[PDB]
Design a binder for this molecule. Structure first.
Ligand SMILES: OC[C@H]1O[C@@H](O)[C@H](O)[C@@H](O)[C@@H]1O
Ligand SMILES: OC[C@H]1O[C@@H](O)[C@H](O)[C@@H](O)[C@@H]1O
Ligand SMILES: OC[C@H]1O[C@@H](O)[C@H](O)[C@@H](O)[C@@H]1O
Ligand SMILES: OC[C@H]1O[C@@H](O)[C@H](O)[C@@H](O)[C@@H]1O
Ligand code: NI
Ligand code: NI
Lengths: 363, 363
């Protein structure tokens, strides 16, 4: 049985898996704050039932694929996946709209990466406040920087019934939020334990990858239905597949943050190796790491100047970052990383100082 | 208003707090496994509704205080707390039994630390299998060792209506399980974030500690009702108070484990400083740490010999342990720690080797 085919989907549909209720947190919008995520950590998926308190702005649930076309443009080239889990290709949006309303489902076409930040649609959607507060690119990417800035904050997803996206780790080790405006999406979520990552890498490389349901190889594969008006936040590194059971229109975006830097670096390294994408959807990952390194040093200096202590998660994140910094700048690795280092950063000193501040904060 | 008084309790009772449902996990007995705790971590309280699958052995819910007396002995001296949150004192068990059945509640007396391992009662109670699997003392304390072995595996608790135990961290940085055989207990649980620990230390030292409800000073104080037949597991460091709303008989025990060693060391250090106990209920904490250090080194060596990787939590735990090892053996600190070091342990080499194995496992 080939992954993505109609028989594969018919079978997937009848499966139950482990209940998402065993792992997800379900705060209200008002409860999902920075403090909440610092205290709770952001290590399991978070499903918010109603959008109230999330600080989003969205069109009404009456919004359509035709509307998307109007705000984005008929002529926009968009990446489409032919859900016979086969190929990628470009398509004019108007041609997709034609396919969509045609109702002809001989080919199952899925749109999941229409980034609309530079279109009129951008004015109609504001992302969750928590994301805007956490996001590295949003808060810590310097205006003066001359590197290409990642542009992955606003995606529109348009998925016909029976769309399937196979298990993957989100690009660049990012976390992601998804809001289903209409229809439903089913996420199959797997925790990125070292053990699961090993199985994932093995499966990603196996010759019969398209015939093996990854969720079967792990201890726990959690099924999470995200229905109309609901918002899902997936933490760094979580391995997941998505079945679209009914026609779905959704919005989402990808971000990096400081809550679990070790997991972020790890997810980044693994996905970089395993990805079959032709482009880095998150360019200059390392660059932003360097800037964050300096900012975290500043935080530690400040806390010490004021006789206060950092939260544990920051200490650990700063340490894992510093390990990465040393690895990227070793004599023999430097050639493959130098290009990503901002010309304003003195790496040897940043590393030395970070190490010092971190030593003055352990026990 | 003084903490522990009848008016304090009457007021506590009407309070709602944050719902425990926001943080606790509620697996079944069969689900609560070592793998479960390694994957999920053990960082939030765990409430298991039915004992099935937990591997415990318990008398029936018809067991009584009179029965306890029969299996433990009328003449056993037991630590009693006079729940006018005032004093500790010793009592013969038979005198407590007299007080209990007397029904006279002019004094509110609470028994929470009757350790019965060396009595006939021990034969009637077997602790949860997960605890026996995790426990450091149970699995890693060497037979040949000549240090006094902590004896904290089996407690019987007998608590009249309106008993109150004020906010505290469990002794020796231990984790704890409690099974309510009859009645109910209400736990007020606070996460041991660095920020909360700072407030806790401040409150523990404040001159009007007995007039300040600690739960009010923190972002989140979670109320968790543990009813008949239910079992609660509290992770390392969690700050908690207990109100007994109705006559309660319960069993419990304290253990150390390897899932979050940093938090364990931290909780140990803080509780050691703040405790007003005359005795260490967990003697030789450092001793067992040293033995665990060597065992973890052995694990790392094994994994490397077999070209396999350790789980992330073990790497972090091994690191925090090694930091402690260095701190305990610095020239100027050594005098206050040398007594706890097993004469079979070569600390300088253990530390060097641990550090080496840990470096060979980061990235
Ligand atoms: O996708 C199916 C839905 O949208 C269009 O593609 C079809 O024309 C409609 O008949 C249907 O309601
Ligand atoms: O991150 C997930 C990656 O692993 C596998 O799913 C595939 O080989 C890639 O197409 C994918 O990008
Ligand atoms: O604690 C109260 C309960 O046990 C005894 O102390 C009393 O004699 C009983 O009347 C009551 O059922
Ligand atoms: O661990 C908690 C400790 O802090 C405060 O509750 C009190 O000062 C001690 O009696 C207690 O042992
Ligand atoms: Ni995704
Ligand atoms: Ni306790």
């Amino acid at each position: 049985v080939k992954t993505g085919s109609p028989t594969f989907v018919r079978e997937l549909r009848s499966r139950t898996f482990d209940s998402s209720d065993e792992v997800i947190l379900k705060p209200t919008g008002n409860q999902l704050t920075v403090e909440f995520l610092e205290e709770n950590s952001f290590s399991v998926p978070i499903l918010v039932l109603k959008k109230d308190g999330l600080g989003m702005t969205l069109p009404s649930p009456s919004f359509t694929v035709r509307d998307v076309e109007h705000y984005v443009g008929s002529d926009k080239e968009i990446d489409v996946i032919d859900v016979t889990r086969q190929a990628d290709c470009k398509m004019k949006l108007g041609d997709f709209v034609k396919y969509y309303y045609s109702g002809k489902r001989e080919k199952v076409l899925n749109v999941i990466s229409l980034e609309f930040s530079d279109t009129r649609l951008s004015n109609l959607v504001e992302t969750p406040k928590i994301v805007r507060k956490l996001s590295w690119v949003e808060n810590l990417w310097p205006e003066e920087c001359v590197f290409e800035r990642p542009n992955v904050q606003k995606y529109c997803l348009m998925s016909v019934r029976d769309s399937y996206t196979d298990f993957h780790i989100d690009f660049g080790g990012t976390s992601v939020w998804y809001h289903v405006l209409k229809g439903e999406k089913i996420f199959y979520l797997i925790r990125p334990t070292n053990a699961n990552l090993t199985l994932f890498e093995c499966w990603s490389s196996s010759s019969n990858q398209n015939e093996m349901f990854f969720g079967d190889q792990v201890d726990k594969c959690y099924k999470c239905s995200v229905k109309q008006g609901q918002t899902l936040f997936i933490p760094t590194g979580w391995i997941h597949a998505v079945l679209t059971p009914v026609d779905c229109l959704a919005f989402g975006g990808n971000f990096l943050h400081s809550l679990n830097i070790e997991m972020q670096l790890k997810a980044y390294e693994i996905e970089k190796r395993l990805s079959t994408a032709d482009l880095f959807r998150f360019p200059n990952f390392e660059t932003i790491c360097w800037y964050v390194g300096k900012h975290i040093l500043d935080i530690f200096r400040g806390l010490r100047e004021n006789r206060r202590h950092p939260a544990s998660y920051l200490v650990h994140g700063g340490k894992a970052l510093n390990l990465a910094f040393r690895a990227w700048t070793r004599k023999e690795a430097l050639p493959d990383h130098e290009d990503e280092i901002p010309e304003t950063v003195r790496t040897v000193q940043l590393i030395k100082d970070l190490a010092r501040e971190i030593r003055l904060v352990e026990d």
